[PDB]
Amino acid sequence: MISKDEILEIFDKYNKDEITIATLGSHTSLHILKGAKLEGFSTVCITMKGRDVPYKRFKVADKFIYVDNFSDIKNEEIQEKLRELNSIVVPHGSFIAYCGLDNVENSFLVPMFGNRRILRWESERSLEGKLLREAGLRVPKKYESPEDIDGTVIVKFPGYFIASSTEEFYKKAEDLKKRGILTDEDIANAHIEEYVVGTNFCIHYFYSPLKDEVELLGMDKRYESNIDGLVRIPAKDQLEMNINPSYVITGNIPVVIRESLLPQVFEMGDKLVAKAKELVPPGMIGPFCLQSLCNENLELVVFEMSARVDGGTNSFMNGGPYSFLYNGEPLSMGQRIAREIKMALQLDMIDKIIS
Amino acid sequence: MISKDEILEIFDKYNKDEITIATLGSHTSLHILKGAKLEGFSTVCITMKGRDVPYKRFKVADKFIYVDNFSDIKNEEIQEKLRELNSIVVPHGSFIAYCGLDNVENSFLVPMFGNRRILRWESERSLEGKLLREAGLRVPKKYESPEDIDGTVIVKFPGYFIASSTEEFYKKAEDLKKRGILTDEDIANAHIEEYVVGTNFCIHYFYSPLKDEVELLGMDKRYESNIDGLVRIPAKDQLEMNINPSYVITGNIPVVIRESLLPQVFEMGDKLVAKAKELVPPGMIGPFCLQSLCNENLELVVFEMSARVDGGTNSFMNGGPYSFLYNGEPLSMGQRIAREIKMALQLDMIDKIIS
Amino acid sequence: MISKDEILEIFDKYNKDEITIATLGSHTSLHILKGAKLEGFSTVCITMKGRDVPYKRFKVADKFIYVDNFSDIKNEEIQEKLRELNSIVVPHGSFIAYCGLDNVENSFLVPMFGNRRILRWESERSLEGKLLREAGLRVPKKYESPEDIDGTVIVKFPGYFIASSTEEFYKKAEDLKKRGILTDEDIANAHIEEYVVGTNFCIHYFYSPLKDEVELLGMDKRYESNIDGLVRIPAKDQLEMNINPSYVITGNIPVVIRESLLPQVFEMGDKLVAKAKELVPPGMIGPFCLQSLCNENLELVVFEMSARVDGGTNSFMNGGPYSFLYNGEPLSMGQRIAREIKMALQLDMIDKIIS
Amino acid sequence: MISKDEILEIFDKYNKDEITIATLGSHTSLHILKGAKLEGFSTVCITMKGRDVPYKRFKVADKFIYVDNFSDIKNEEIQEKLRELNSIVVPHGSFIAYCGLDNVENSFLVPMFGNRRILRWESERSLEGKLLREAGLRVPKKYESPEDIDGTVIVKFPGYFIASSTEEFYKKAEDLKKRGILTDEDIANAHIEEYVVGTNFCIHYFYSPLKDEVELLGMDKRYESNIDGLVRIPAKDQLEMNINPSYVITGNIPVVIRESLLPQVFEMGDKLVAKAKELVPPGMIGPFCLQSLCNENLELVVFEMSARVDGGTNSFMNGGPYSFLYNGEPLSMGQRIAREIKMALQLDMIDKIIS
Amino acid sequence: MISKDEILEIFDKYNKDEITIATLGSHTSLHILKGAKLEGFSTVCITMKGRDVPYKRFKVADKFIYVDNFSDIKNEEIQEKLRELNSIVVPHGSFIAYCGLDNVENSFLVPMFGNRRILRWESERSLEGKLLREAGLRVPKKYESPEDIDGTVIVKFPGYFIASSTEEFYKKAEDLKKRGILTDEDIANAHIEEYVVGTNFCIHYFYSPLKDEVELLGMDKRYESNIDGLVRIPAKDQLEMNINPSYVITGNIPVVIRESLLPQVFEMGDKLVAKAKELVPPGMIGPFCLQSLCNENLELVVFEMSARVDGGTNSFMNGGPYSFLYNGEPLSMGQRIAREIKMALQLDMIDKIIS
Ligand SMILES: Nc1ncnc2c1ncn2[C@@H]1O[C@H](COP(=O)(O)O)[C@@H](O)[C@H]1O
Ligand SMILES: Nc1ncnc2c1ncn2[C@@H]1O[C@H](COP(=O)(O)O)[C@@H](O)[C@H]1O
Ligand SMILES: Nc1ncnc2c1ncn2[C@@H]1O[C@H](COP(=O)(O)O)[C@@H](O)[C@H]1O
Ligand SMILES: Nc1ncnc2c1ncn2[C@@H]1O[C@H](COP(=O)(O)O)[C@@H](O)[C@H]1O
Ligand SMILES: Nc1ncnc2c1ncn2[C@@H]1O[C@H](COP(=O)(O)O)[C@@H](O)[C@H]1O
Ligand SMILES: Nc1ncnc2c1ncn2[C@@H]1O[C@H](COP(=O)(O)O)[C@@H](O)[C@H]1O
Ligand SMILES: Nc1ncnc2c1ncn2[C@@H]1O[C@H](COP(=O)(O)O)[C@@H](O)[C@H]1O
Ligand SMILES: Nc1ncnc2c1ncn2[C@@H]1O[C@H](COP(=O)(O)O)[C@@H](O)[C@H]1O
Ligand SMILES: Nc1ncnc2c1ncn2[C@@H]1O[C@H](COP(=O)(O)O)[C@@H](O)[C@H]1O
Ligand SMILES: Nc1ncnc2c1ncn2[C@@H]1O[C@H](COP(=O)(O)O)[C@@H](O)[C@H]1O
Ligand SMILES: [Cl-]
Ligand SMILES: [Cl-]
Ligand SMILES: [Cl-]
Ligand SMILES: [Cl-]
Ligand SMILES: [Cl-]
Ligand SMILES: [Cl-]
Ligand SMILES: [Cl-]
Ligand SMILES: [Cl-]
Ligand SMILES: [Cl-]
Ligand SMILES: [Cl-]
């Protein structure tokens, strides 16, 4: 519901000489806040007791807004402190969750870097799949029901398993049921897709509305538990175990792609951006990630995407091999965001980057 | 056939005040061209439509030479543009392939960084094995025929499989045949070697003919599809699949070796360089890679080598842990190459580095 | 036995205008010595023939003290050269081993960065376990005997295997016996613990006695042979092999943790430091590492620790994502150590950092 | 009157996680505020309409406190805003004047970098002369009355002229009287001293109470109007003019001293600092300037001093030849001040640097 | 008398892994020693009590060799310490004076950066004038005797005055005699030359024997006492004084030349270098200064030169406008010298730079 004009008029009461960058202390905020300082900004960190130490010891925040629980960040009281500080908020995974995506879309009256509307399109698998399919991107083959399974599939519930047949599907669902991990309602909405066998590249892009350009900033591969620990056990020993794989994100590892695949990499970002302009105007604004798998035919297949900054940007907080090429600098995504905020304030084009 | 004097006399007609660095837009050209700019050079990128975006958006090339297909880079027309631009060409994997190694050796009349003759020694498994064996380096044990198999082996055809017996060899060859991946002629020339079980270090060295020194620049491990995706599937599920491993390079991951192994690391490069001087004068010039596996006895076994810059240098385009030690700089291999070109022009010793 | 006053009075005869940093040429000495140079120090490297090349080519040492074998570094002759050079010695894994931990504790009369006494607490599994348990840290569940095994365990002998039952334990012990890898005396003291299935984070901390603060410097995951090569073999092929896993450290790979887990990360270091002050005064001084595994419940379980600089700091010799946040610099652990030595000399507080 | 305990207890109610650096927008505030940002601080600038542009366009201040006139900076309202911002104030020439030195000494209840008491000793020519004389420094010879004049003298009134005799003194005083530049009361308190003929070095020092050390940061020579414009007129033309010299500071020019004179330079700062400890405890804190003239006998004679930061530090806001030697950095005095504030907060020694 | 082979054979007994840079603590040693550290060298400073503080507080020397008086630096004892430290000595104005130029030429058996023989050519006005005249450089017109004076001249004695006639010459000589500044023997050897009226540029060049190139590093103007203080007194007041000008170097001020005059600037260095090769082989090595005055016809007239590093390089110890152009670095002359020492050691060409 929140209007653009409604947000531009909040920002107009802002002291344009004292624009700060704010965010929630979690997810990717260390380089969001570091990147801001490096660009000249004073920074605001929403934090809480027991969770504030990393931001205090890394010296990355100038002002703290302590909440009782991160859930309070929807409260109109915190919105006020943020407006009085002239903060532009940089959204990220954790902020959207603790604030709630409905509160974000029509109850959070603080200026926000990026296209506010499009945060819904990453939250819903149908919108996400619609976008990736319509943008012309390779995605895993989808399966309507367990009876349609004719290969190895992975099965996700909004807590994960692999199946190579209809029969294996139910045996495994049953296991995860009689172990108190999945209720009958989760499996009633099981999402089944082709298991893509390949190398993980989570590709971090930045779309600049100022330059009208998609940029490559970096790449990581996920480090997930228990799976990346499960597959480190020798095959003979794994068979002696009664252990199911889980896919809980615990961290990230840096990777570079084969250089001949960069034309495919940019075309993917270009296409995604050209379609999102049509479907959710103005489209992708700033940081976005295609989480893909590269098969043996050197084709990147995208199984996920983010419409804002992705946790994997943490793997290059001191810059990376791709962020370096632009200007020989240790450039993070956080700093690339802050720079866009800076240039837009200087060119009087803040309307291209906030909502 | 191309003579050294034949190349020195092409370079003598060069305007020594305007020496550019050229390369093909692929493989490792992003840091070759970035590294050149950082050293003061103007840069030339051979590119083509649909494949030029990465070089335009990374702002790494000053002049583009567009070809219809990269195969045209042998054409005497492109050789002329390069000579008129006073370009020294930096060779790499992709350039040699698209240009053709015979065209490189006697039909490509543009000055080239490195020892031109020695590019043949990396192309032929017999020359390569000859060199590594004569340099005194550990290599996988070789097997003349499937009947000689007495352990786990890996089998390569100039598309890969593992066997632990003669019987398994044929069963697998048959599979890859009746699946249209290998013709009877490929398996007629199957290369069988010991499967080395260990940690991958692709070690990137630079030999300076100016300093008469082998330098350590960095290290990566390969990220290959489908294999690195295959082994991420739990053992129980893998057994339910009918899937063969492939070993297609898709990218790279940074790694550092145990420091006590660096004396072995340098001795390997020293030895390789001392033997290549004898076998293919003047020997190794500039960048070279030993692709090795470290067994549990802390011995590096080399299964491959490159006689020019290797794709893994991309993992440290913003510098790495070893390239940093020299001068505290974000030094890439591309920039280390450009620096040698610079120093040689300044010391009037271009004859030590081109051919 | 070596007293603090005994060491302060050695250091008092030091020319305070010419303080050098010394260490043994191995383990982590490349960034210890590089970091020192960067902070203004002249550096001393204990090295030997055949093992000195890495330090000569990286140009990281100003003065060499050549020994016949690294075992000689206990010799009172080498202690004298070090005292005459005004060297503070930075201890590390290799130095303690070659010098011998008893010689370190009462026969090595050279000033040393860190708490000398506490190097014993990392050497003994009982002290180490005592400390981690009393500090309140999660550790693997321990097993008194093979008959207590009720899950997957890993078994270590001061050369490793996994067991999922009492029966499997003996079958495997027998195998490693009848293969000449373990004598009956090793298995008589077998250390059996819970096999933690998860993602490896070796977390590198620095405790500053000057700032009274625990800092996060970086993180790596181990790269071990043959295990990380064993699990890269497809499950079907592994079953055709008669191969046991080994866990020999060969190198390291960079990783970042999920940012929401940093509060747990710092609390772990804080707790460890607060307990070590009580148990071994003054406690942890400078660099320390918690080597942990993150399970699917996002809990870090510590299976090992170091009470000095850990080999994994090599993964960020050119700085890392966390070391960057402080001041936007390529900061290594080696340089963080040297800086503390520098600040302490400038503030006349060398008594807070040496022993 | 303002007590130290009275100031420590104001600072104790400060949020130690959000310490800002404040100052008045004038004099030397550009590098005071720039230097602060570079050290990680958020900055507060006291400014006013018509005088705020330089600080807005140089992007050097995060928060502005607008006053009606700089005279309002004594007002208890502005003191409150400063306390609520957790600001340490950095004093300078302009701040003391607009605030009034009595208000500074007992009516300005905001923490302040430096020794508050000693700002009186630079304001009074008797205290200043007492200090320089007792510290053992060369100063111009003083003259009790016009009748004591036996050489070339310069005559100052708290607007300047040169005399070489008693007679010339009165003729000139009369001129400046019958021209409405000096009243009979100014000349009733005329300060007459030896005219020192030599080269101007305004030497900028920093005393660190943390390191107990006097540091050399830089040097400038004054650029004064109309005098430096008067002496640029050829002698023949000057004689055709009826023009008196004035000595109004308009700017500064960088200079380096002859290196053999640096031992004299440091001894002067050392001596000044050792005497000020006795006379006005704790003595000199942070930045101080000896404004001297070097005669042909290579002796520096001091005609003025500042007990805080001097305007000449502006000549090296991007660092200078001496500030560079420490760490190869573009270090300004402003940044050297901010660093001391930083280190003191980190070492819990804020009591050594504020009052 | 000292031979080159005699010096090469001293240097051959040097540990080539531990080459240090040494110099006397005075003149230009701050950037000589800083520049060395920046290039990776350990540094040796010859100093003495009462004169060592600047080098201790600037942290620029790793090892001190204390002498009783700087005159002792000729002593064979100090030569030994320097040889045992593997020091290459960098000569400068003060070192040559305290050591004595005869001792330098045949009694100082330590390797020395530059052409040892040519230090005599800067010491003798006849050799100096011979060189500048034969190199084809503009110099002041010379006058054989006071009776030849037909314009404004300046008169120098190996303490200075200006004369516009024969009569004025004697009146002034008489004054300086009856004031005890000049004996009858000084004026018996008075050197009289054209007074050049113009702007002072002391131009600092570096000749690289490695690159065979003359480089422009920077420029300063002298700051001399009492003269630059004398001319700051208004003309009317100067006439009321009985004061003679002196020209004692006290410091330096940075200046840049008009860019259209750089072709003249380089040709002057080129010419000087081409003639010095013939007259004193191998010629100019490393740093040299032409001290010139630019007349209204935009012609640089050289009144002095140095055959080693000149004191004016101190004006750009943090780099300057010209030293910046090469690589965008804060490059001093001291660091440019150290770099040449570094490159020569790396290229095995130390024979091009020492003697
Ligand atoms: N289509 C797929 N094929 C193979 N692995 C997948 C697929 N989708 C997800 N995964 C793995 O499951 C993890 C969690 O996926 P998601 O919850 O979709 O982000 C991913 O990071 C992948 O490692
Ligand atoms: N390092 C990371 N890599 C990838 N995804 C992440 C990372 N950190 C957080 N996320 C995602 O963002 C969500 C919120 O993060 P958290 O607050 O850490 O639970 C998680 O559910 C993850 O899907
Ligand atoms: N001797 C070997 N033992 C084990 N793995 C190998 C061996 N040779 C090659 N490989 C794997 O196969 C991939 C392709 O090898 P190549 O085609 O020889 O460069 C390598 O990157 C290795 O990961
Ligand atoms: N990132 C890389 N790592 C290792 N080898 C590579 C890499 N990129 C390319 N290569 C090798 O160079 C050849 C040509 O590269 P491409 O043009 O990308 O196919 C390939 O066949 C690979 O063997
Ligand atoms: N409790 C455990 N659970 C699983 N793996 C372990 C455990 N302890 C050690 N390891 C693995 O064995 C290697 C050697 O362990 P350690 O010798 O205890 O340092 C470690 O780096 C781990 O990869
Ligand atoms: N890169 C590394 N990562 C982790 N641990 C290491 C590393 N290097 C050495 N160590 C440990 O330090 C000990 C001595 O090292 P080394 O002298 O290399 O054998 C080894 O036994 C290892 O446990
Ligand atoms: N004793 C002196 N001899 C010569 N010039 C002076 C003397 N004192 C002050 N001046 C000049 O007058 C200017 C103003 O001096 P003051 O007002 O004392 O700071 C100084 O910057 C000097 O250039
Ligand atoms: N650039 C400068 N150099 C030397 N002294 C200065 C400078 N700027 C200001 N001052 C002194 O500080 C006082 C206050 O400065 P202002 O507010 O600029 O008048 C002046 O009376 C000067 O004596
Ligand atoms: N020919 C000349 N004409 C005018 N001024 C000169 C001349 N030679 C020397 N001077 C001045 O006298 C100072 C001392 O000169 P010198 O002792 O020759 O280095 C120089 O720095 C000049 O400022
Ligand atoms: N800063 C400087 N500028 C020009 N010449 C200098 C400088 N410092 C020293 N010299 C010359 O070098 C000689 C020795 O310097 P000193 O030991 O400082 O007397 C002096 O006689 C000067 O001629
Ligand atoms: Cl992203
Ligand atoms: Cl995310
Ligand atoms: Cl390479
Ligand atoms: Cl390659
Ligand atoms: Cl550590
Ligand atoms: Cl270790
Ligand atoms: Cl000052
Ligand atoms: Cl001032
Ligand atoms: Cl010079
Ligand atoms: Cl000089």
Say whether D31 counts as a known binding-site residue: no
HSE-up (13 A, CA, CB side) for residue C253: 25
Which of E52, E63, E65, E346 is the best mutation test for C, with the most CBs of C within 10 A? Answer: E63
- As a whole number of angstroms, the distance between CA C81 and CA C119 comes to 24
Instruction: Find, among A287, A269, A278, A275, the residue nearest to A353 by Cα.
Output: A287
- As a whole number of angstroms, the distance between CA D174 and CA E80 comes to 70
Structure tokens that stand for B256 in this block: 């550092």
Q: Give the position, in ligand 7's atom list, of the atom nearest the Cα of D222.
A: 21
- Out of E122, E304, E306, mutate this one to test ligand 9's pocket (max ligand atoms within 8 Å of CB): namely E304
Identify the structural domains of chain B with CATH numbers, from first to last. Answer: 1-111 (3.40.50.20), 112-139+198-355 (3.30.470.20), 140-197 (3.30.1490.20)
| Tokens 């022009």 found at | B345
Q: From the DSSP assignment, how many helices (H) and strands (E) are in chain C? A: 13, 14
Say whether B27 counts as a known binding-site residue: yes
Report whether E145 contacts E173 (CB < 8 A).
no
Nearest CA residue ID for atom 2, ligand 6: C311
Phi-psi region of C152 (alpha: psi -120 to 50; beta: other; left: phi over 0): beta
Q: Give the distance from CA D112 to its chain's centroid.
A: 16
**Cα→Cα distances B340→A153, B287, B335, Å:** 52, 11, 9
B344: Cβ contacts below 8 Å, ≥ 6 apart: B210, B350, B352, B353
Structure tokens that stand for B235 in this block: 């053992």
The number of beta carbons lying within 10 Å of the beta carbon of residue B123 is: 14
Sign of CA dihedral E72, E74, E80, E84: positive
Long-range residue pairs from E167-171, CB within 8 A, at least 24 positions apart, any chain: E170/E146
D256 touching E (Cβ < 8 Å): yes
> CA of C326: which chain A residue's CA is closest?
A58
Question: Strands of A247-254's sheet, edge to edge?
Answer: A300-306, A286-294, A199-208, A213-226, A247-254, C256-257
Q: B157 — phi, psi (to 5°)?
A: -130, 125
Q: What is the dihedral of CA C305, C308, C312, C315, to 10 degrees?
A: 150
Helix, strand or coil, per DSSP, at residue E12: coil
Report whether D130 contacts D272 (CB < 8 A).
no
- As a whole number of angstroms, the distance between CA A289 and CA A219 comes to 9
Q: Which of A197, A256, A293 comes nearest B314 by C-beta?
A: A256
Beta bridge partners of A300: A294
Structure tokens that stand for C56 in this block: 């000569």
Structure tokens that stand for B158 in this block: 């100039």
B210 touching E (Cβ < 8 Å): yes
Instruction: Find, among C159, C205, C156, C193, the residue nearest to C179 by Cα.
Output: C159
Report whether D262 contacts D216 (CB < 8 A).
yes
- As a whole number of angstroms, the distance between CA D24 and CA D32 comes to 10
Q: Is C57 exposed, middle or buried (0-12, 13-18, 19+ CB in 10 A)?
A: middle
Sign of CA dihedral E160, E164, E166, E167: negative
Report whether A269 contacts A159 (CB < 8 A).
no
Report whether D33 contacts D41 (CB < 8 A).
no
Sign of CA dihedral C298, C299, C304, C305: positive
Positions of chain breaks in chain D, given as the residue before each break (C to N > 2.5 Å): 158
**Cα→Cα distances E71→A47, E47, E48, E78, E103, Å:** 66, 11, 11, 11, 11
Q: From the DSSP assignment, how many helices (H) and strands (E) are in chain B? A: 13, 14
Structure tokens that stand for E212 in this block: 């065979």
Mode of pairing for the β-strands spanning D153-156 and C160-163:
unpaired
As a residue count, chain A comes to 355
Report whether D265 contacts D300 (CB < 8 A).
yes
The conformation of residue E139, written as its DSSP 8-state character, comes to -
Instruction: Find, among D314, D316, D308, D294, the residue nearest to D337 by Cα.
Output: D308
Instruction: Find, among E28, E7, E92, E44, the residue nearest to E350 by Cα.
Output: E7
- As a whole number of angstroms, the distance between CA D299 and CA D302 comes to 10
User: CA angle, E138 as apex, E136 and E142 as ends, to 5°?
Assistant: 110
Report whether D31 contacts D334 (CB < 8 A).
yes
Report whether B70 contacts B48 (CB < 8 A).
yes
| DSSP string of E271-308, one letter each residue | HHHHHHHHHSTT---EEEEEEEEE-TTS-EEEEEEESS
Distance from CA of C161 to the nearest CA of B (A): 14
> CA of A238: which chain B residue's CA is closest?
B235
Sign of CA dihedral C62, C67, C68, C71: negative
Instruction: Find, among A247, A260, A248, A257, the residue nearest to A204 by Cα.
Output: A257
The number of beta carbons lying within 10 Å of the beta carbon of residue B26 is: 28
Distance from CA of E348 to the nearest CA of B (A): 8
Say whether D157 counts as a known binding-site residue: yes
At C2, the amino acid letter reads I
- As a whole number of angstroms, the distance between CA A271 and CA A274 comes to 5
* E205 Cα–ligand 19 center, Å: 6
Instruction: Find, among C136, C129, C117, the residue nearest to C156 by Cα.
Output: C129
Phi-psi region of D305 (alpha: psi -120 to 50; beta: other; left: phi over 0): beta
At A351, the amino acid letter reads D
HSE-up (13 A, CA, CB side) for residue B235: 24
Distance from CA of E55 to the nearest CA of B (A): 24
Which other chains touch chain C, taking contact as 3+ CB pairs less than 8 Å apart?
A, B, D, E
Q: B21 — phi, psi (to 5°)?
A: -110, 125
The number of beta carbons lying within 10 Å of the beta carbon of residue B234 is: 24
Q: Give the position, in ligand 9's atom list, of the atom nearest the Cα of E196.
A: 3
Structure tokens that stand for B328 in this block: 């505290």
Report whether C316 contacts C323 (CB < 8 A).
yes
| DSSP string of D252-320, one letter each residue | EEE-EE-GGGHHHHHHHHHHHHHHHHHHSTT---EEEEEEEEE-TTS-EEEEEEESSB-GGGGGGTT--
* D194 Cα–ligand 7 center, Å: 10
Give the method used: X-ray
Report whether C290 contacts C219 (CB < 8 A).
no
- As a whole number of angstroms, the distance between CA D204 and CA D266 comes to 11
- As a whole number of angstroms, the distance between CA C251 and CA B256 comes to 5
Q: What is the dihedral of CA C239, C241, C243, C249, to 10 degrees?
A: -80
- As a whole number of angstroms, the distance between CA C252 and CA C264 comes to 23
Chain A residues 42-71 within an 8 A CB cutoff of chain D? 42, 56, 59, 62-64
Q: From the DSSP assignment, how many helices (H) and strands (E) are in chain D? A: 13, 14
* C232 Cα–ligand 6 center, Å: 23
Say whether D107 counts as a known binding-site residue: no
Helix, strand or coil, per DSSP, at residue C34: helix
Instruction: Find, among C46, C55, C51, C44, the residue nearest to C21 by Cα.
Output: C44
Say whether B252 counts as a known binding-site residue: yes
Report whether D25 contacts D56 (CB < 8 A).
no
The conformation of residue C112, written as its DSSP 8-state character, comes to B
Phi-psi region of B36 (alpha: psi -120 to 50; beta: other; left: phi over 0): alpha
The conformation of residue C187, written as its DSSP 8-state character, comes to G
Structure tokens that stand for E65 in this block: 């060799």
| Tokens 């005997």 found at | C145
Q: C84-103 in b/e burial notation, b at 16+ Cβ within 10 A?
A: ebbbbbbbbbbbbbbbeeee
Strands (E), E147-198: 153-156, 160-163, 191-194
At C195, the amino acid letter reads Y
Instruction: Find, among D140, D143, D128, D118, the residue nearest to D303 by Cα.
Output: D140
Sign of CA dihedral D12, D18, D24, D29: positive
- Helix C125-134 and helix C262-279: axis angle, to 10°? 120
The number of beta carbons lying within 10 Å of the beta carbon of residue D244 is: 19
Beta bridge partners of A150: none
Structure tokens that stand for B25 in this block: 């837009």
Instruction: Find, among D2, D3, D4, the residue nearest to D353 by Cα.
Output: D4
Strands (E), chain A: 20-24, 43-47, 63-66, 87-89, 142-143, 153-156, 160-163, 191-194, 199-208, 213-226, 247-254, 256-257, 286-294, 300-306
Helix boundaries (H) for chain C:
4-11, 29-38, 53-57, 76-84, 93-99, 101-106, 120-123, 125-134, 166-177, 227-230, 235-239, 262-279, 333-347
The conformation of residue D8, written as its DSSP 8-state character, comes to H
- As a whole number of angstroms, the distance between CA E23 and CA E45 comes to 5
Instruction: Find, among C210, C191, C220, C196, the residue nearest to C290 by Cα.
Output: C220
- As a whole number of angstroms, the distance between CA B33 and CA A320 comes to 17
Q: Give the position, in ligand 4's atom list, of the atom nearest the Cα of B220.
A: 3
* A17 Cα–ligand 8 center, Å: 27
Which other chains touch chain A, taking contact as 3+ CB pairs less than 8 Å apart?
B, C, D
Helix, strand or coil, per DSSP, at residue A204: strand
At E51, the amino acid letter reads R
The conformation of residue E141, written as its DSSP 8-state character, comes to P
Resolution of the PDB structure in angstroms: 2.3
Report whether E225 contacts D296 (CB < 8 A).
yes
Instruction: Find, among E155, E134, E132, E135, the residue nearest to E143 by Cα.
Output: E155
Q: D77-99 in b/e burial notation, b at 16+ Cβ within 10 A?
A: ebbebbbebbbbbbbbbbbbbbb
| Tokens 């008797």 found at | D126
Helix-, strand-, coil-residue percentages of chain E, each rounded to 5: 40, 25, 35
Instruction: Find, among B300, B296, B284, the residue nearest to B352 by Cα.
Output: B284
CB contact under 8 A, B240 and A324: no
Helix, strand or coil, per DSSP, at residue C107: coil
As a residue count, chain E comes to 355
For ligand 10, is residue E306 a contact (CB within 6 Å)?
no
D147 touching C (Cβ < 8 Å): no
Q: From the DSSP assignment, how many helices (H) and strands (E) are in chain A? A: 13, 14
Q: Is D40 exposed, middle or buried (0-12, 13-18, 19+ CB in 10 A)?
A: middle
- Helix B262-279 and helix B125-134: axis angle, to 10°? 120
Structure tokens that stand for E20 in this block: 């240090």
Positions of chain breaks in chain C, given as the residue before each break (C to N > 2.5 Å): 158
| Tokens 């101080």 found at | D288
At D176, the amino acid letter reads L
The number of beta carbons lying within 10 Å of the beta carbon of residue B158 is: 9
D299: Cβ contacts below 8 Å, ≥ 6 apart: D138, D264
Beta bridge partners of B43: B21
| DSSP string of C119-173, one letter each residue | GHHHH-HHHHHHHHHHTT---PPEESSGGG--S-EEEE---EEEESSHHHHHHHH
Q: B83 — phi, psi (to 5°)?
A: -70, -35
Collect all residues of chain C within an 8 Å Cβ-Cβ radius of residue D211. 346-347
- As a whole number of angstroms, the distance between CA B112 and CA C89 comes to 48
Q: From the DSSP assignment, how many helices (H) and strands (E) are in chain E? A: 13, 13
- As a whole number of angstroms, the distance between CA B47 and CA B64 comes to 7
> CA of C28: which chain B residue's CA is closest?
B259
